[PDB]
């Protein structure tokens, strides 16, 4: 029976490292023509080629793992390895090995989860994601939190190529120097940023931000575009 | 004038490291109440909080940088730092520093690009992304490549919780042991996988895959579901 017996994986913390094994059974990795390939599959997504090592020490790597993952083969154990270093949360996936030109006799796959924590993060949702407006218009932008954040809510403005700029802190406090046409308020479980009369310099992207708990989280932003 | 003068960044290769600087002007980082926060923004996306360090050495980190990035402040230079280690392509973003509870007096931002290569990757598009079918139906799944891949095209089948399985190699060659109801062909600049009569064991996800050039690339998959 020709098959690959995989081992390793598990849950590690980011910056960590681990090594996956893939033992060949029924054939030899030193045999001419034979190669071992590693493929991964993030939860809910498709397949991504990572690396391939051939019998003659030739090898290729995907840009997503270059400088971090190395592929190897030990003839003495007839076993191939993926040495995974400096993992990030985006390395979370099921990892497969496969023999040789088409991938055949896949290993069973093992999940590698890269996580430092759960998931108590407060999610901020802004509405709408974009809106069209003319100079002099009243503009209302809403925001809500997945938990009670009290009044610990800031509003930021960002123009293209520029850094964000604080407009309103603690729900309704206008930042010194920001025009009073900007105001913030909080109704039943959600927040609103209001521009009483839109001025030409106000076409930008606006972000809410909670700071009642770390991690600080932003909303996805609302683009205010010219009509 | 109260402002933060940022420096550093640039293009590095994955697994690399670099350090961003943020020099305070008009205030002191040792002053009680003062903190420095790093925020990043991927191209086309919103804001993500990374880390905050306070005057009294207290600090907090986001899970996306834990174990890889460290935040620091040098009183002798009145300068804060983000030490970024083991970067990946997903760290590509504009990085901002900001003073202190709301982020004010943002730095200008600097782009950090983490890339090992361009972009000559052949993209594979499958159609449809999912289809409904009944037992005994004829099923056709199409695939196309962003470049000419000749007949270097494989077709894989994957069931939930299982590893992919090779069905057809080199466009039309049926894999030994796969039922002959599966067949592959290639028309004008695109490829087709055909199941002449769908059997109950055939409800799965199907992937195309080119191997005319590294990196090997897969299609996004086609789910064949029961009607």
What are the DSSP calls for B36-67, one per residue? EEEEEE-TTS-EEEEEEEETTS-EEE-TTTTT
Resolution number, Å: 2.2
Does residue B104 fall inside a structural domain? yes
Residues of chain A with C-beta less than 8 angstroms from the C-beta of B64:
14, 88-89
Looking at the structure, do residues B22 and B69 belong to the same domain, yes or no?
A: yes
Q: How far apart are the CA of A128 and the nearest CA of chain B, in angstroms?
A: 14
Looking at the structure, do residues B26 and B68 belong to the same domain, yes or no?
A: yes
Does residue B189 fall inside a structural domain? yes
**Cβ <8 Å between A13 and B66:** yes
Query: Which among B5, B94, B75, B84 has a CA at the least distance from the CA of B34?
Result: B75
Query: Which among A186, A61, A158 has a CA at the least distance from the CA of B14?
Result: A61
Structure determination technique employed: X-ray
Q: Which residues 6+ apart lie within 8 Å of B97 measured at CB?
A: B4, B6, B20, B22, B36, B37, B38, B39, B80, B82, B106, B107
CATH code for the domain in which residue A189 is found: 2.60.40.10
Tell me how crowded residue A74 is: count the other CB atoms within 10 A of its CB.
12
Looking at the structure, do residues B43 and B136 belong to the same domain, yes or no?
A: no
Cα angle, residue A187 at apex, residues A181 and A193 outer, rounded to 5°: 25
Number of structural domains found in chain B: 2
Q: Which residues 6+ apart lie within 8 Å of B173 measured at CB?
A: B184
* Sheet order of strands, A190-195 included: A124-127, A139-145, A190-195, A182-186
Q: How far apart are the CA of B200 and the nearest CA of chain A, in angstroms?
A: 23
Q: How far is CA B99 from the centre of its chain?
A: 30
d(CA B7, CA B20): 6
Tell me how crowded residue A117 is: count the other CB atoms within 10 A of its CB.
11
Looking at the structure, do residues A9 and A75 belong to the same domain, yes or no?
A: yes
Looking at the structure, do residues B62 and B28 belong to the same domain, yes or no?
A: yes
Assess A68–B contact: CB distance below 8 Å, yes or no. yes
Looking at the structure, do residues B81 and B181 belong to the same domain, yes or no?
A: no
Looking at the structure, do residues A147 and A98 belong to the same domain, yes or no?
A: no
Token pair recorded at residue A47: 């397949």
d(CA A121, CA A100): 43
CB A136 within 8 A of CB A197: yes
**Cβ <8 Å between B211 and A109:** no
Query: Which among B98, B13, B80 has a CA at the least distance from the CA of A156?
Result: B98
Burial of residue A150 (number of CB atoms within 10 Å: 0-12, 13-18, 19+): exposed
Looking at the structure, do residues B137 and B80 belong to the same domain, yes or no?
A: no
CB B194 within 8 A of CB B139: yes
CB B41 within 8 A of CB B107: no
Q: How far apart are the CA of B125 and the nearest CA of chain A, in angstroms?
A: 12
Assess B69–A contact: CB distance below 8 Å, yes or no. no
Per this entry, what is the length of chain A?
227
Tell me how crowded residue B196 is: count the other CB atoms within 10 A of its CB.
15
**Cβ <8 Å between A107 and B154:** no
Looking at the structure, do residues A12 and A62 belong to the same domain, yes or no?
A: yes
Query: Which among A7, A21, A154, A51 has a CA at the least distance from the CA of B101?
Result: A154
Does residue B142 fall inside a structural domain? yes
Query: Which among B88, B102, B109, B87 has a CA at the least distance from the CA of B39?
Result: B109
d(CA B159, CA A80): 25
CB B1 within 8 A of CB B25: yes
CA A215 vs CA A11, A100, B4, B115: distances in Å:
22, 44, 23, 28
Q: How far apart are the CA of A162 and the nearest CA of chain B, in angstroms?
A: 7
- Of B60, B89, B114, the last residue of a domain is B114
Residue B198, domain extent: 124-226
Assess B35–A contact: CB distance below 8 Å, yes or no. no
d(CA B117, CA B43): 17
Looking at the structure, do residues B104 and B132 belong to the same domain, yes or no?
A: no
Does residue B14 fall inside a structural domain? yes
List the beta bridge partners of residue B115.
Answer: none
CA A207 vs CA A111, B37, B43: distances in Å:
36, 17, 16
Q: What is the dihedral of CA B79, B80, B83, B89, to 10 degrees?
A: -110
d(CA A210, CA A151): 9
**Among B67, B102, B164, whose Cβ lies nearest the Cβ of A15?**
B67
Token pair recorded at residue B176: 């030994």
């Amino acid at each position: 029976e020709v098959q690959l017996v995989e081992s390793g994986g598990g849950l590690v913390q980011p910056g960590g490292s681990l090594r996956l094994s893939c033992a060949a059974s029924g054939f030899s990795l030193s045999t001419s023509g034979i190669g071992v390939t590693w493929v991964r599959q993030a939860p809910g997504k498709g397949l991504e080629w990572l690396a391939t090592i051939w019998w003659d020490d030739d090898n290729r790597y995907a840009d997503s793992v270059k400088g971090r993952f190395t592929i190897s083969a030990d003839t003495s154990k007839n076993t191939a390895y993926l040495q995974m270093n400096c993992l990030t949360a985006e390395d979370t996936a099921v990892y497969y090995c496969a023999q040789s030109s088409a991938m055949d006799h896949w290993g069973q796959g093992t999940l590698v989860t890269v996580s430092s924590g759960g998931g108590s993060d407060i999610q901020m949702t802004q509405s709408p994601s974009s809106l069209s407006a003319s100079v002099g218009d009243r503009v209302t932008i809403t925001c809500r939190a997945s938990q009670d954040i009290s009044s610990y809510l800031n509003w930021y403005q960002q123009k293209p190529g520029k850094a964000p700029k604080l407009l309103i802190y603690y729900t309704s406090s206008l930042h010194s120097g920001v025009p009073s046409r900007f105001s913030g308020s909080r109704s039943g479980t959600d927040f609103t940023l209001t521009i009483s009369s839109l001025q030409p310099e106000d076409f930008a992207t606006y972000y809410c931000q909670q700071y009642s708990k770390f991690p600080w989280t932003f909303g996805q932003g609302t683009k205010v575009e010219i009509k």
